[PDB]
Paper text:
The structure of an Ah TssA2A [name] domain construct (D231-L374) was solved to 1.76 Å with four subunits (chains A–D) in the asymmetric unit arranged as two independent dimers, consistent with previous SEC analysis, that showed that Ah TssA2A [name] exists as dimers in solution. Each monomer folds into a cluster of seven α-helices (α1–α7), the arrangement of which is very similar to that of the EAEC TssA2B [name] domain (RMSD = 2.0 Å) as determined by structural alignment. Specifically, the related regions include helices α1-α5 of Bc TssA1B Sd1 (i.e. most of the ImpA_N region) and α2–α6 of Ah TssA2A [name]. This similarity suggests that an ancient gene duplication event may have played a role in the evolution of the Nt1 and [name] domains of TssA2 subunits. Following refinement, these dimers could be seen to be essentially identical in structure to that of the dimer formed by the isolated TssA2A [name] domain (RMSD = 0.4 Å).
Contractile bacteriophages of the family Myoviridae (i.e. T4), R-type pyocins and the type VI secretion system (T6SS) of Gram-negative bacteria are evolutionarily related nano-scale injection machines that puncture target cell membranes using a shared contraction mechanism. [name] subunits are enigmatic as they possess a conserved N-terminal region of unknown function, previously identified as ImpA_N (PFAM: PF0681226), whereas sequences located C-terminal to this region are highly divergent. Consistent with this, phylogenetic analysis has suggested that the [name] family can be subdivided into three clades (TssA1, TssA2 and TssA3). The structural studies presented here show that TssA1B, TssA2A and TssA2B possess structurally diverse CTDs that lead to distinct overall architectures for their respective complexes.
Numbering used by the authors:
A (entry chain C), B (entry chain D): 231 to 376
Write the structure that this text describes.
């Protein structure tokens, strides 16, 4: 399973490099990252999991850059999503970058894949990182619904 | 490149085998079969391309089996649409088996992927095999519209 995850991520990287505008490489990366998750993370009071939040400075850098997105930025957001599986805000940014680069079909696939994931594991919508920041903000939640 | 196609197919096969209810492996197979087609086949009179139609006995076998669909049937249909990339009727049948076996998300994904391919190459809607049978039957066409 660990090696399979790696095989899927390498194949996804190759698909994405070759055709940034094609959805399937992006979908395969989501499967690689998420398919192994069958139980939601344990949590204490307030549904706070003992998992580190994304660095808010790292997140502010990506936010800043959305005024002029490029592949470099998009790659960093994607890499962050692969390292931080519950950072759902990253999928919203990623789809926003896709949309701004003219990759409509990829933006849509990114929304759908997060929707599918959350349909399988709905309890994830209620959980937070160790600092009380939500996996899924009310903004990301509304974005997904829309 | 050939080895890339084969790599994609093997990954796709293993994703489908492990999780037959999960869309992404089916999607990966489509990309493998179709991504290298940027031009539609040449044709002569009657929009007949010089490509062999699917064996009618083979198709009669799959249709008869739709009475009691199983994994074996589904695999054969899938193998056939891998070997015969323009046999769109086979996607309809695949999605019908998916539906019947309770895999609705997969059925939907099969429809989406074919509509996507047809959006990229719309002249494929007007072509036929060497005996005049259409790449896209009116039945397949109606299924996509639904």
């Amino acid at each position: 399973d660990r090696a399979w995850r790696q095989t899927q991520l390498k194949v996804a990287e190759l698909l994405i490099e070759r055709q940034p505008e094609v959805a399937v490489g992006y979908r395969l990366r989501r499967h690689a990252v998420w398919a192994g998750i069958t139980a939601v993370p344990m949590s204490g009071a307030g549904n706070k999991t003992p998992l580190a939040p994304m660095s808010a400075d790292m997140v502010d850098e990506y936010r800043a850059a959305m005024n002029a997105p490029d592949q470099g930025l998009w790659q960093r957001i994607e890499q962050s999503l692969t390292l931080a599986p519950y950072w759902f805000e990253g999928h919203r940014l990623s789809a926003e970058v896709a949309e701004k680069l003219g990759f409509g079909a990829v933006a849509q696939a990114i929304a759908e894949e997060l929707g599918t994931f959350l349909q399988r594991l709905p309890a994830l919508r209620e959980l937070a990182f160790s600092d009380g920041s939500p996996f899924l903000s009310p903004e990301c939640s509304r974005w997904l619904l829309e």
